[PDB]
Amino acid sequence: MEELRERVWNGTINVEVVVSDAIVVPNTTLADKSCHIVMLRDAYLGFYLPTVVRKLADTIKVPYESDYRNWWFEYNGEGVPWEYPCGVLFDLLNKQMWELQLCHGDKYPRGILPLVDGHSQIKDYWRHQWKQACFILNGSAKRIMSLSIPDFENFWVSILSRNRSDFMAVRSKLFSMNKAKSLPVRVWTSNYAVLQPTVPVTLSVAELLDSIKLSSVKSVIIQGIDVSIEDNIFELYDIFASIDGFLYLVTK
Template sequence: MNEIRQLIWNGELNVLVSIDPSFLMKGSPKEMAVLRIRVPRETYLINYMPLIWDRIQDFLSFDPLNEKEKYFWFEHNGRPIRWNYPVGVLFDGLVASNATFATPSEIHLENAITFFRVHLVMGESLPSTVIPILSSSNQAEKFWFHQWKQVCFILNGSSKGIMSLSVNESRKFWRSVITRNFHDFTEISNKISPSRPRHVPIIIQNHKDLGTGGISQPTIRMAGVNPTLRDIEEEVFSAKEIIDAESYVIVAQGIEIPWDTALLDLYLKFRSFDGFLYITLVPKISVTKIFP
C-alpha cells in the first residue's frame, strides 16, 4: 500500500499561471505575466504565492503584501476555483468539463505538454465560493491543520490524536508537505489515522460544480462493515437527483475507480494530504469528448 501512496505523493502537474495585466506596470514585458511551474498534486496553489510574487516583484504596480482594498483569487476558464482544495483535486474536477488545458494548435500534437491553466486576478469584491488569498505566510498551514482536526474527529470520534501532537511534531507534519518528505508525513499521519476508522472522511465533487458550491461531504459509517462505492451510491449522489450511476465515472487522484471498490481500501490508498478522500463524479459523455 505504501508504494501506491508514494506514487500519489510524487505525482505532479504542469501549471501555467497567468497574471492579470492590471498587476503590472505599463510597459512590462509580456512574458512576465506568465509563469510555468511543476506542482505536486498534493499541495495548495497558494503555497506558490511567494514564488509568483517574487517572479513579478520588479514589475508590480502595487505592493501585494500591503494591499488592503483588493482581493486576490484564482480562476480557470473564467470561473473562480478554490485554492483550499488540493491541486490534483482541482485538476480532476475540471479536466473532463472542458478542453482548455491545451491550445487549439497543441490538441493534435502527440508530444504536447498538458498544462493546468490558472489565472490570478484581483478585485474589490470576492466571489462567494472562494476563500480570499491573504498575505499571511501561514494561511495554508492553518487551513490544512484545521482540515486534519476535522479528519481526526471523523476517523476517531475525537480530535485528541492530532491535538496531542507535540509542537515539534506539528511543525514536522506541515514541513513534510512543503519539503515533500513522504517518510515524515507517513510517520505522523499514521499516528492520527486508525486502521479501522469509525467513519470515512470523504468529499465528493461533480466536475461541473467546482466553482458553484455543489460539493457534498456525506457521513459514511464503517462500524462492522466495509461498503463498496456501489453500496453508498445514495450518499454519493444527492437524494434530490435522479441519476444513473452507470452514466458516471468515479475519479480519485486522477485515476478511474471501479464502483465495486471497497471504501476503506480506497481511503487508505487514495486519501489526500489533508486526510480527506476526494472523489470526482465525471459523466461518461464528458470523458468520451475529452479522451476519445
C-alpha cells in the first residue's frame, strides 16, 4: 500500500570508496585509503563527492583546486555515469558492498559528464530531468512550469532533507497516474547503454522488452529488487520511479 514506497525512499546501499592507484600517496595502508559510507539509492553520487574527498584528502598524493572539478568515480576501471541515481548505477554495474575508486585527473574519462558546480549543477540537471519526465507524462511542461519558485525549491530540498511527504506533495502537483499519456521509462542493456522506450498508457515488463528486442531471463532489476517480467509497468512506475521521474529497468 504505502509500506513499499517508504522502503524505496529509504533505499540504501553499502559503498566502499578507495583512492585510485593513480593518485594515492606511495604505499599507504588500504585501511587508510578507504572509507565506507551508506548512500541513498535515490540520491546522486555527486552528493557524496566532497565528503569522500574530505575523508581521504590525507591519502591523496596529487594536488587539487577543489572538491568537485576533475573528480569522478570508477568501478572496475570504468568511469561511473553519475548523472543517474546511485541505486540505478548500483543495480547496473555491481557484481552487499559496492567498491568504487576515487579518481582525479586533468582529463575526464570519455563520456563522463564533468561535475564542476556541485549541488547547483546537480540541481539544474535534476530539474531538467523532471522538466522532461513531465512532457512524457502530460504532453507539455505545463504542470511543472506552473510551480511557484519556493514550491519547486521545496521539491529540491525534499531530496536533500529526505522529507518524503514534501516530495510526494509537489510530485502530485506535476502529474496524476490516472491521467497520464505516456510514462517515463529507461532501460539498460547488457552493454551498459540506455534506451528511452516510448510507452504510452492504454503493458507488462515482458511485453515492453519484446517490443524493444531485449528479452531472454525471467526477472528484471528495479530499485534493487528482482521484478517478474510479468508485472504491470504502469504500476511499477507509480511505485518505483526514481527521484528524477523515470522508472529504470536493468536487464539481466
